[PDB]
């Protein structure tokens, strides 16, 4: 594949979630009607939506939720969470 250094990402108990993956999920969250993507996005005045993420970079396909994002439409608020062992906040690693 093409050469590239590591861009900013979220460290979810050792699994990196790429910034591009998170932004794609937020874009999907805000172009979908609430609940339509197998129950998501859900809603948390600056509208915040909650939407699942994958570690594979692939868009989430319904079914199991290991990671999720809570974000506003322009990502000025953007936090990533994991569910393993109880909900926890992933660590943003800026590059």
mmCIF file with all atom_site columns, C-alpha atoms in Angstrom:
data_model
loop_
_atom_site.group_PDB
_atom_site.id
_atom_site.type_symbol
_atom_site.label_atom_id
_atom_site.label_alt_id
_atom_site.label_comp_id
_atom_site.label_asym_id
_atom_site.label_entity_id
_atom_site.label_seq_id
_atom_site.pdbx_PDB_ins_code
_atom_site.Cartn_x
_atom_site.Cartn_y
_atom_site.Cartn_z
_atom_site.occupancy
_atom_site.B_iso_or_equiv
_atom_site.pdbx_formal_charge
_atom_site.auth_seq_id
_atom_site.auth_comp_id
_atom_site.auth_asym_id
_atom_site.auth_atom_id
_atom_site.pdbx_PDB_model_num
ATOM 1  C CA . UNK A 1 1  ? 0.000   0.000  0.000  1.00 0.00 ? 1  UNK A CA 1
ATOM 2  C CA . UNK A 1 2  ? 1.053   3.641  -0.036 1.00 0.00 ? 2  UNK A CA 1
ATOM 3  C CA . UNK A 1 3  ? 3.605   4.777  2.503  1.00 0.00 ? 3  UNK A CA 1
ATOM 4  C CA . UNK A 1 4  ? 2.297   6.926  5.306  1.00 0.00 ? 4  UNK A CA 1
ATOM 5  C CA . UNK A 1 5  ? 3.260   7.875  8.819  1.00 0.00 ? 5  UNK A CA 1
ATOM 6  C CA . UNK A 1 6  ? 0.836   7.363  11.642 1.00 0.00 ? 6  UNK A CA 1
ATOM 7  C CA . UNK A 1 7  ? -1.862  10.012 11.931 1.00 0.00 ? 7  UNK A CA 1
ATOM 8  C CA . UNK A 1 8  ? -3.696  10.950 15.119 1.00 0.00 ? 8  UNK A CA 1
ATOM 9  C CA . UNK A 1 9  ? -5.764  8.177  16.564 1.00 0.00 ? 9  UNK A CA 1
ATOM 10 C CA . UNK A 1 10 ? -7.647  7.032  19.637 1.00 0.00 ? 10 UNK A CA 1
ATOM 11 C CA . UNK A 1 11 ? -6.095  4.332  21.830 1.00 0.00 ? 11 UNK A CA 1
ATOM 12 C CA . UNK A 1 12 ? -8.871  2.090  23.079 1.00 0.00 ? 12 UNK A CA 1
ATOM 13 C CA . UNK A 1 13 ? -7.109  -0.309 25.472 1.00 0.00 ? 13 UNK A CA 1
ATOM 14 C CA . UNK A 1 14 ? -4.334  -0.789 22.969 1.00 0.00 ? 14 UNK A CA 1
ATOM 15 C CA . UNK A 1 15 ? -6.391  -0.909 19.769 1.00 0.00 ? 15 UNK A CA 1
ATOM 16 C CA . UNK A 1 16 ? -5.879  2.199  17.594 1.00 0.00 ? 16 UNK A CA 1
ATOM 17 C CA . UNK A 1 17 ? -8.984  3.779  16.063 1.00 0.00 ? 17 UNK A CA 1
ATOM 18 C CA . UNK A 1 18 ? -7.868  6.016  13.215 1.00 0.00 ? 18 UNK A CA 1
ATOM 19 C CA . UNK A 1 19 ? -9.003  9.626  13.043 1.00 0.00 ? 19 UNK A CA 1
ATOM 20 C CA . UNK A 1 20 ? -10.332 9.047  9.533  1.00 0.00 ? 20 UNK A CA 1
ATOM 21 C CA . UNK A 1 21 ? -12.448 6.177  10.827 1.00 0.00 ? 21 UNK A CA 1
ATOM 22 C CA . UNK A 1 22 ? -13.959 8.303  13.572 1.00 0.00 ? 22 UNK A CA 1
ATOM 23 C CA . UNK A 1 23 ? -14.701 11.182 11.216 1.00 0.00 ? 23 UNK A CA 1
ATOM 24 C CA . UNK A 1 24 ? -16.361 8.801  8.743  1.00 0.00 ? 24 UNK A CA 1
ATOM 25 C CA . UNK A 1 25 ? -18.555 7.494  11.544 1.00 0.00 ? 25 UNK A CA 1
ATOM 26 C CA . UNK A 1 26 ? -19.528 10.984 12.651 1.00 0.00 ? 26 UNK A CA 1
ATOM 27 C CA . UNK A 1 27 ? -20.359 11.896 9.050  1.00 0.00 ? 27 UNK A CA 1
ATOM 28 C CA . UNK A 1 28 ? -22.574 8.800  8.833  1.00 0.00 ? 28 UNK A CA 1
ATOM 29 C CA . UNK A 1 29 ? -24.199 9.574  12.197 1.00 0.00 ? 29 UNK A CA 1
ATOM 30 C CA . UNK A 1 30 ? -25.270 13.015 10.996 1.00 0.00 ? 30 UNK A CA 1
ATOM 31 C CA . UNK A 1 31 ? -26.425 11.968 7.548  1.00 0.00 ? 31 UNK A CA 1
ATOM 32 C CA . UNK A 1 32 ? -28.679 9.216  8.984  1.00 0.00 ? 32 UNK A CA 1
ATOM 33 C CA . UNK A 1 33 ? -32.000 9.613  10.767 1.00 0.00 ? 33 UNK A CA 1
ATOM 34 C CA . UNK A 1 34 ? -31.857 8.784  14.481 1.00 0.00 ? 34 UNK A CA 1
ATOM 35 C CA . UNK A 1 35 ? -32.110 5.081  15.115 1.00 0.00 ? 35 UNK A CA 1
ATOM 36 C CA . UNK A 1 36 ? -32.089 4.022  11.473 1.00 0.00 ? 36 UNK A CA 1
ATOM 37 C CA . UNK A 1 37 ? -28.701 2.241  11.384 1.00 0.00 ? 37 UNK A CA 1
ATOM 38 C CA . UNK A 1 38 ? -29.779 -0.733 13.544 1.00 0.00 ? 38 UNK A CA 1
ATOM 39 C CA . UNK A 1 39 ? -30.688 1.580  16.437 1.00 0.00 ? 39 UNK A CA 1
ATOM 40 C CA . UNK A 1 40 ? -28.151 4.333  15.869 1.00 0.00 ? 40 UNK A CA 1
ATOM 41 C CA . UNK A 1 41 ? -27.345 7.110  15.907 1.00 0.00 ? 41 UNK A CA 1
ATOM 42 C CA . UNK A 1 42 ? -28.843 7.965  19.271 1.00 0.00 ? 42 UNK A CA 1
ATOM 43 C CA . UNK A 1 43 ? -29.038 11.445 20.800 1.00 0.00 ? 43 UNK A CA 1
ATOM 44 C CA . UNK A 1 44 ? -27.107 12.519 23.887 1.00 0.00 ? 44 UNK A CA 1
ATOM 45 C CA . UNK A 1 45 ? -27.958 23.672 21.972 1.00 0.00 ? 45 UNK A CA 1
ATOM 46 C CA . UNK A 1 46 ? -25.322 21.633 20.078 1.00 0.00 ? 46 UNK A CA 1
ATOM 47 C CA . UNK A 1 47 ? -26.741 18.280 18.941 1.00 0.00 ? 47 UNK A CA 1
ATOM 48 C CA . UNK A 1 48 ? -24.612 15.337 20.066 1.00 0.00 ? 48 UNK A CA 1
ATOM 49 C CA . UNK A 1 49 ? -25.018 11.939 18.432 1.00 0.00 ? 49 UNK A CA 1
ATOM 50 C CA . UNK A 1 50 ? -23.719 8.573  19.588 1.00 0.00 ? 50 UNK A CA 1
ATOM 51 C CA . UNK A 1 51 ? -22.675 6.063  16.932 1.00 0.00 ? 51 UNK A CA 1
ATOM 52 C CA . UNK A 1 52 ? -20.692 2.787  16.844 1.00 0.00 ? 52 UNK A CA 1
ATOM 53 C CA . UNK A 1 53 ? -17.175 2.421  15.472 1.00 0.00 ? 53 UNK A CA 1
ATOM 54 C CA . UNK A 1 54 ? -15.082 -0.545 14.390 1.00 0.00 ? 54 UNK A CA 1
ATOM 55 C CA . UNK A 1 55 ? -11.406 -1.343 14.856 1.00 0.00 ? 55 UNK A CA 1
ATOM 56 C CA . UNK A 1 56 ? -11.256 -2.597 11.258 1.00 0.00 ? 56 UNK A CA 1
ATOM 57 C CA . UNK A 1 57 ? -11.831 0.819  9.713  1.00 0.00 ? 57 UNK A CA 1
ATOM 58 C CA . UNK A 1 58 ? -14.961 -0.694 8.188  1.00 0.00 ? 58 UNK A CA 1
ATOM 59 C CA . UNK A 1 59 ? -18.241 1.048  8.832  1.00 0.00 ? 59 UNK A CA 1
ATOM 60 C CA . UNK A 1 60 ? -20.236 -0.629 11.588 1.00 0.00 ? 60 UNK A CA 1
ATOM 61 C CA . UNK A 1 61 ? -22.657 -3.224 10.330 1.00 0.00 ? 61 UNK A CA 1
ATOM 62 C CA . UNK A 1 62 ? -25.180 -3.541 13.170 1.00 0.00 ? 62 UNK A CA 1
ATOM 63 C CA . UNK A 1 63 ? -24.624 -6.039 15.908 1.00 0.00 ? 63 UNK A CA 1
ATOM 64 C CA . UNK A 1 64 ? -21.821 -5.900 18.410 1.00 0.00 ? 64 UNK A CA 1
ATOM 65 C CA . UNK A 1 65 ? -20.605 -2.531 19.722 1.00 0.00 ? 65 UNK A CA 1
ATOM 66 C CA . UNK A 1 66 ? -17.048 -2.489 21.063 1.00 0.00 ? 66 UNK A CA 1
ATOM 67 C CA . UNK A 1 67 ? -16.276 1.209  20.409 1.00 0.00 ? 67 UNK A CA 1
ATOM 68 C CA . UNK A 1 68 ? -18.425 4.250  19.800 1.00 0.00 ? 68 UNK A CA 1
ATOM 69 C CA . UNK A 1 69 ? -18.148 7.974  19.203 1.00 0.00 ? 69 UNK A CA 1
ATOM 70 C CA . UNK A 1 70 ? -20.092 10.863 20.715 1.00 0.00 ? 70 UNK A CA 1
ATOM 71 C CA . UNK A 1 71 ? -19.771 13.944 18.499 1.00 0.00 ? 71 UNK A CA 1
ATOM 72 C CA . UNK A 1 72 ? -21.312 17.099 17.128 1.00 0.00 ? 72 UNK A CA 1
ATOM 73 C CA . UNK A 1 73 ? -21.813 17.465 13.385 1.00 0.00 ? 73 UNK A CA 1
ATOM 74 C CA . UNK A 1 74 ? -18.521 19.324 12.853 1.00 0.00 ? 74 UNK A CA 1
ATOM 75 C CA . UNK A 1 75 ? -16.604 17.194 15.386 1.00 0.00 ? 75 UNK A CA 1
ATOM 76 C CA . UNK A 1 76 ? -15.761 20.216 17.554 1.00 0.00 ? 76 UNK A CA 1
ATOM 77 C CA . UNK A 1 77 ? -16.963 17.828 20.259 1.00 0.00 ? 77 UNK A CA 1
ATOM 78 C CA . UNK A 1 78 ? -15.609 14.337 19.607 1.00 0.00 ? 78 UNK A CA 1
ATOM 79 C CA . UNK A 1 79 ? -14.993 11.655 22.215 1.00 0.00 ? 79 UNK A CA 1
ATOM 80 C CA . UNK A 1 80 ? -14.423 7.963  21.675 1.00 0.00 ? 80 UNK A CA 1
ATOM 81 C CA . UNK A 1 81 ? -15.449 5.226  24.089 1.00 0.00 ? 81 UNK A CA 1
ATOM 82 C CA . UNK A 1 82 ? -15.067 1.536  24.488 1.00 0.00 ? 82 UNK A CA 1
ATOM 83 C CA . UNK A 1 83 ? -17.380 -0.984 26.138 1.00 0.00 ? 83 UNK A CA 1
ATOM 84 C CA . UNK A 1 84 ? -15.036 -3.795 27.236 1.00 0.00 ? 84 UNK A CA 1
ATOM 85 C CA . UNK A 1 85 ? -15.157 -4.190 30.987 1.00 0.00 ? 85 UNK A CA 1
ATOM 86 C CA . UNK A 1 86 ? -17.544 -1.283 31.339 1.00 0.00 ? 86 UNK A CA 1
ATOM 87 C CA . UNK A 1 87 ? -17.654 1.964  29.435 1.00 0.00 ? 87 UNK A CA 1
ATOM 88 C CA . UNK A 1 88 ? -14.395 3.883  29.337 1.00 0.00 ? 88 UNK A CA 1
ATOM 89 C CA . UNK A 1 89 ? -12.979 6.887  27.494 1.00 0.00 ? 89 UNK A CA 1
ATOM 90 C CA . UNK A 1 90 ? -10.318 6.108  24.910 1.00 0.00 ? 90 UNK A CA 1
ATOM 91 C CA . UNK A 1 91 ? -7.153  8.192  24.831 1.00 0.00 ? 91 UNK A CA 1
ATOM 92 C CA . UNK A 1 92 ? -6.647  10.617 21.958 1.00 0.00 ? 92 UNK A CA 1
ATOM 93 C CA . UNK A 1 93 ? -3.098  10.345 20.647 1.00 0.00 ? 93 UNK A CA 1
ATOM 94 C CA . UNK A 1 94 ? -2.366  13.440 18.564 1.00 0.00 ? 94 UNK A CA 1
ATOM 95 C CA . UNK A 1 95 ? 0.289   13.034 15.867 1.00 0.00 ? 95 UNK A CA 1
#
